[PDB]
Structures are given as structure tokens and as C-alpha cells.
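hey so i finally got around to running the thing on that chain from the lab meeting. sorry it took forever, my laptop kept dying and i had to restart like 3 times. anyway pasting the input first so we r on the same page abt which one it is
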Amino acid sequence: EFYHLVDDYGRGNGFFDKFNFFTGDDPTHGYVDYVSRDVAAGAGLIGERDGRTYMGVDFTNPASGRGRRSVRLESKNTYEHGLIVIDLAHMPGSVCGTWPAFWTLGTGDWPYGGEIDIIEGVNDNTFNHMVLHTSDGCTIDNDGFTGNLKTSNCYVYAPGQDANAGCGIEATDPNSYGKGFNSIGGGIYATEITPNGISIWFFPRGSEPGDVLGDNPNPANWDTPAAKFAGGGCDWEGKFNAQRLIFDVTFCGDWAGNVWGIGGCASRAANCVDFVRDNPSAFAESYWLVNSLRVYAP
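ok and heres what got predicted. didnt touch it at all, straight out
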């Protein structure tokens, strides 16, 4: 009643069988070499670790070619309305030069089917950033969530914002991302998509509701979400269509590479690319460790 399970991703190979591995050049122009499932398996980039599904990057070899090896998985199934719940024991760390994301992407030409970034950040970020990217004509209200609103216009080319900033909300818990998240053993991110808006809850390890992992979650009884995107400034139903789930870690590129120079990573090397190419050992923490991924429908 309210929500029922429609898709449990399981773990290991059964989990990977539910995704297509993207191998094209990075759309965000990162210094990354997305590899095939076979190559990933052969490189230790994907697998299982004590029952948890693992997806990481090459932290052994000096990089060459398109960039450091990683994987980008995009789900075979798509969902228009629903509740996506991911329980993570570990996510890519706050590593200089990286840009991990767990997100959703609509069908058709971007940004017309919408995009939802659930877990995303760069370099040595502390806080998670939850963000929507849409076509023109979608802004959100500033209430109903605990995070800090950074940009109110979800349009990817919104007038007063950096290109492709979208409408983002920054989480206030320092354990919501990277280093901190991993120090507590991770947690759960649940995101609900309805005809009236999107909500994303973050439950640090141990603080989750008793029904969040079960077969009939009821978000209506959960604590205030970390981010909520709603309001009359957007036709929620028309701005987002069927979404596929995506996991990736890219390096440098349009965001991480672009801000390398003004942050705490500037001292590691003159450029982001030089650091990522020459310091493989730095990326050992850049991996996802999934306990479960389950999608529900109303």
C-alpha cells in the first residue's frame, strides 16, 4: 500500500546483468577511459566483496589514452514514477581529481527527459550535492528540505547560473558524501519521483526507518528530506520522463578539472590531468560498495 517493489537489482553478476556498460568518450570531457564489462572484470574494476557489489577505478597503472580506466553503468530498465533506494557501504571518496555520481537520466535528447543527480561531487568535497537538470521552464521552491539551496533554476542554461549548474541543494551532514560517508560505513539514499516533484532522503548508517529496505516503504512517514524539488514553477510531469539509473566515476573534465585550481587540490599538481595520469595509488578509495539497490512503484 503506497509503494511496492518492482525491481530488485540483487548483487554481483546478476546486478551487472541489469546494466549496459557505456564505453563512449565521456560526455563531460573527463580524463577517463570507460571500459567494457569484460575489461572491467579483467582489471578488478567490478566484482563482489563479501556480498556487496563493487564498482571502482584503476588505482594501479599510470594512465594513457583517453584517461584513467573506470566504468559507467546505465540501467537496462527505466522508471517514470517511483522510489529508488540505494544502501551503500562505501562510495567513491573525497579524492582529488575524481567526479563520482549515482544519478538518473531521462530518455531522448538531454536535458529534455530530465536528469536527477542523487549522489554527486568532485575532488575533496565534503557535502553531497543533489541536483536536477532540465529543459527551460523549471524552478523550485525554497522549502520542505533540510539541505542548503544553492541554485533555484533547474534549466541547464539558466540565466544567472554557471553553465549546467541546474537546481542544486547541498546536504548539511558532512557524512553525506565521500570521506565522511565512508568513515561511518555509508548509509541510504532514497529518492522519490512523482507527478508533483522529486525528494531525496539521506539516512546515515544506523538511522534508517524500519520500512526503508522492506517491500512496502512509506516515505510519507519519514523525517524531512535532505532535498526536495517542487513548486508551481515547474511542470514536474512533463519535464521528466522514464529514467535509467547510472553509476560512474569520471576524472577532471567540465567540473572537477575546471575547479582544480581554486580548491584544496591545486597543490597536488599544476593540472588535474597530470595528477590523475601520474598518481594511480591516489584512487584506491574511488569505489562504490552496494548493499542493495531496489526500485518501487506507487
